[PDB]
Amino acid sequence: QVITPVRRKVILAMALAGLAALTSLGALLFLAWSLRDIRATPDAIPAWPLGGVIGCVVLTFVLRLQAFNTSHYAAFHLENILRSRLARKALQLPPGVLQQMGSGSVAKVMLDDVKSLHIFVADSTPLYARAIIMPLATIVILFWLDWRLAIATLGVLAFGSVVLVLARQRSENMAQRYHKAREQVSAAVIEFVQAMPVVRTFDSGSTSFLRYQRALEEWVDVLKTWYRKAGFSARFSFSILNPLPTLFVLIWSGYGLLHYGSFDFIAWVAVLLLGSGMAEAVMPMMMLNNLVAQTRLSIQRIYQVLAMPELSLPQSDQQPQEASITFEQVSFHYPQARTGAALQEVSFHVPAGQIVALVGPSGAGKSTVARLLLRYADPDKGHIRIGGVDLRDMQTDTLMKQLSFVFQDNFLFADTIANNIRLGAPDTPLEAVIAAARVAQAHDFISALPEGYNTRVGERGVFLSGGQRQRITIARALLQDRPILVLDEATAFADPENEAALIKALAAAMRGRTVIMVAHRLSMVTQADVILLFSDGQLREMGNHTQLLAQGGLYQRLWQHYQQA
């Protein structure tokens, strides 16, 4: 049915396992043929039918082995194609739809969904071939072998399904209600196990534990009544797939046919084998339906992940360009949280070479400018003329070249010398690298770390990272030139050494750069060229620190607030 995947190899594996099931039926039929040859005449060992038995067994095993190999190769290739397409889509993903939306969801999908697709293909194509070819070929062979006892084995298979489907008159009405009770208890256990490190500093934990206990004792009364709904149906289906009802029908039709015209005995045993095969072929149908439902769920998840971002409108065409930083009539909202306007027509020129430290309301109309500079998103109304032409013609390599972001957290990898190398130039100019760490005054604590400069910090190395990740990434910004420097928030690390050493490191960082030091304190606001005020997305004043202090507007109010503490 589905054409765009690896359909040639997986349809070959499905038809190959189907032919393997048909030759296993051939082996059983040749076994009944051989026992006919030995019961109609007890003689020497029969050559041709027993040779057909051992040949059909070894052909069935070889064919099923090749179907296994080809289906697992199809699953491995589809897992590789899916991981490659997810990596190439997530590489070209708009980053404001990435870190803010689904930071851990992309690794969750790119592990769990592709493992689900591998497991589904490789473990579900022989199940497909068995459960659609074995019980539709055994019925033909049984109708050929005996006109009765195929109706009887179909009767003992269908009596279970008739009583099972008739049992839905006492209906369930518990898919959506049970599922919302399951979601409710899986929320109220997560709320508890998050509330447990916090509430213990209060009273001993009684109200949160009572909320968790009374959210357990409702889900128990959902689960138990779900079991007492599904009890007869599942126990009766698990008792009807036992081979003993089929054996009971075969035996007590073997005694019921000795009276009213005897079917021959070897035709009876040829019914006895294939009827039990047809009886056991109901359970892998239920297993492949179980796998198909959750695989359809995971494929809907992979298609919403594959359809949610579209390339962030990329153009690498225009130029690198000087007269570095401006804005032009941008009024952009913050996506997926506020349907308003997180900026309101922000318009300013900045000559290249100066320091524009901007301040505003709590990062709600202040840090989104630094988010919008990197093209984490695009404005719904506006153009960002970084240089001459805006970011619609951005030349996406030069955004990596010209702009050197430094943010408030700056996640690192586990190769600490390459944590300052692998931003802009992957190589080993190690004299220049330690010189750039020397001038940025982060050389000392990395000189003190045990595994040299190449310290495996990982995620457990809290002493190896420390509060100097800003000093590492600022030294990395001093490694390459990258004229526009961007500070989302410096000095948010309030350590006393990070009070002292960050200021000289930034004084070693603002040399020849047109920085934007979005700082939360008014520390380096006094030593900056243009001080922007923001208030709920609207820019309020332009001009220098002492000019805004001399005019005595709302910057006087904010500076008087800051002079209190």
Partner: protein, 568 residues
């Protein structure tokens, strides 16, 4: 085999007797099914030549064996499809909740992986459905051909040996191939785990990797790593499939070899024809539960790991208390020679410190790192016992107080967090849950939060959104101030959020703190000049070693470390 069975019967609860009655019912069901196949021997022996009396005799005995087997299998799955599994996992989750209550808080507070582990048990405890699903299948697979095979040992003896040989070459050889089986799964798995590490590195720093420049080096490195994983998976899978397909077709090759041995012993020896047809029926009957059992041999790995993780977690012992006959009227927190070595990540996080916080107003401190500055506040609630030292509160050790009296004695004010966006009366009630409404209205205006209460709709019973949507850093911090103001704890640890809250709400937060500090000890760490200079007894710590005691004036005029850090 005790080390999984005593865990599986301890990690059920008060349904141990109904689980053992259901295990007994399913074992007798599988054995009686083997006896039904033994009754299928002389039915074929009779039906070969007619014999309506012998066929009626053994067909009514087969009716008895089939009805007893199906009724006992119905009563065996009655354990799951009555409420016994519901009450079993319910009592297990309400044992694990109280184990979350009395675990020492550093064991879950220690690691992000540790909190993600303790988060998992209440939702990964759903595998007991699988542990009652595995019992029937493994019991069929081992018991039923054992009963049929020991029945053949005195019905013709030559099929008995081979049919008794097929299945212990299947499932005990499966659990003896579990070394090589977990070798196969682990040769896939460790490569999958290093790829998962590269994937989570890519997924976390995808923004830095995009805006950095190495989206051609590290990205194509990840893609070549994907191709290397695919080639490793195929190169393992070729030998894995060539070895594993015989394990799946054990019953098929066993069926055809019993066919050949029965045929040569029919034409060479006795009259074993009808018994050969019935043994051919028997082995194809044993085909299906092994075909399910190899489909469940991952779930037994998962269940054994989950039972080991539960009975490794529920062996966690609380903190020792001893001889609580104390009422600490004085609050003089004097750490003396405390040298607490934290973990393998941080070493000696304190080294023989001497701390005294006797003031009824404030006693601040500043430290070097996470070791020396905040792990002393971690020790202050006895999250971990010190490896050497003593924690006095006035005159009484802190290992003598019960955690009710201790956790009502002192109170922390957090960084920002934990309102659960419910009625704010309930949050400043879980301040101290025996509070009336008037106590909330008295202790919420003293945190300067009542204006935000009247500013929001619905009054006091209002939801704050989905995570505190109308609440802000500076407004939701005043909830955490109102909690310690309503609790009236005579010792307050105060993690001041001023570095995040300064320009927008430092006025309101400082007014709430100045309301809070009156007539109780307050221990604060911050970096603001009003908090750096004008605090009180101010401490300086370098890797858990105390220097520069006293006020800020004598340490400043001493010209040591405090003047050096203050001069910048």
């Amino acid at each position: 085999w005790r080390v999984i069975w005593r865990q599986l019967i301890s990690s059920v609860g008060s349904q141990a007797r109904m689980l053992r009655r259901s295990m007994l019912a399913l074992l007798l069901a599988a054995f009686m099914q083997g006896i039904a196949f033994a009754c299928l021997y002389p039915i074929i022996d009779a039906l070969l030549r007619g014999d309506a009396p012998q066929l009626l005799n053994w067909a009514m005995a087969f009716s008895v064996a089939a009805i007893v087997t199906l009724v006992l299998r119905w009563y065996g799955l009655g354990f799951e499809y009555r409420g016994h599994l519901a009450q079993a996992t319910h009592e297990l989750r309400l044992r694990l909740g109280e184990q979350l209550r009395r675990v020492p808080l550093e064991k879950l507070q220690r690691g992000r992986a540790g909190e993600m582990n303790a988060l998992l048990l209440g939702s990964v405890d759903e595998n007991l459905n699988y542990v009652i699903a595995i019992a029937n299948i493994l019991l069929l697979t081992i018991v039923t051909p054992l009963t049929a095979s020991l029945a053949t040992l005195w019905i013709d003896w030559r099929l008995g040996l081979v049919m008794l040989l097929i299945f212990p070459l299947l499932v005990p050889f499966y659990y003896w191939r579990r070394p090589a089986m977990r070798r196969q799964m682990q040769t896939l798995g460790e490569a999958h785990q290093r790829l998962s590490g590269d994937i989570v590195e890519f997924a976390q720093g995808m923004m830095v990797l995009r805006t950095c420049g190495s989206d051609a080096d590290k990205s194509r490195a990840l893609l070549a790593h994907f191709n290397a994983l695919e080639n490793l998976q195929t190169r393992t899978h070729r030998q894995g499939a060539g070895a594993t397909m015989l394990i799946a077709s054990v019953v098929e090759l066993g069926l055809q070899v019993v066919v050949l041995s029965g045929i040569v012993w029919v034409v060479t020896g006795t009259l074993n024809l009808a018994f050969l047809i019935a043994a051919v029926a028997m082995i194809m009957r044993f085909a299906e539960p092994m075909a399910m059992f190899i489909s469940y041999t991952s779930v037994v790995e998962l269940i054994a790991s989950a039972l080991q993780r539960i009975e490794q977690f529920m062996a966690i012992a609380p903190l020792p208390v001893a001889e609580q006959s104390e009422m600490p009227e004085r609050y003089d927190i004097r750490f003396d020679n405390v040298s607490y070595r934290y973990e393998e990540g941080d070493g000696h996080a304190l080294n023989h410190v001497s701390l005294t916080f006797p003031a009824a107003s404030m006693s601040a401190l500043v430290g070097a790192s996470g070791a020396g500055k905040t792990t002393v506040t971690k020790l202050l609630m006895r999250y971990a016992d010190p490896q050497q030292g003593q924690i006095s509160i006035g005159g009484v050790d802190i290992r003598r107080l019960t955690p009710e009296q201790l956790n009502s004695l002192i109170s922390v004010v957090f960084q920002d967090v934990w309102l659960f966006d419910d009625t704010l009366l309930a949050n400043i009630r879980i301040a101290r849950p025996q509070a009336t409404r008037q106590e909330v209205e008295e202790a919420a205006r003293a945190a300067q939060c009542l204006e935000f209460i009247s500013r929001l709709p619905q009054g006091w019973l209002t939801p704050m959104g989905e995570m505190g949507g109308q609440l802000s850093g500076g407004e939701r911090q005043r909830i955490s101030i109102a909690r310690a103001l309503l609790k009236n704890a005579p010792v307050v640890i105060l993690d001041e959020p001023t570095a995040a809250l300064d320009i927008e709400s430092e006025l309101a937060v400082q007014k709430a703190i100045d309301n809070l500090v009156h007539n109780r000890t307050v221990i604060i760490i911050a970096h603001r000049l009003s908090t750096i200079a004008g605090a009180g007894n101010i401490l300086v710590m370098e890797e858990g070693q105390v220097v520069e005691q006293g006020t800020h004036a004598q340490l400043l005029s001493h010209h040591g470390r405090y003047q050096a850090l203050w001069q910048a």
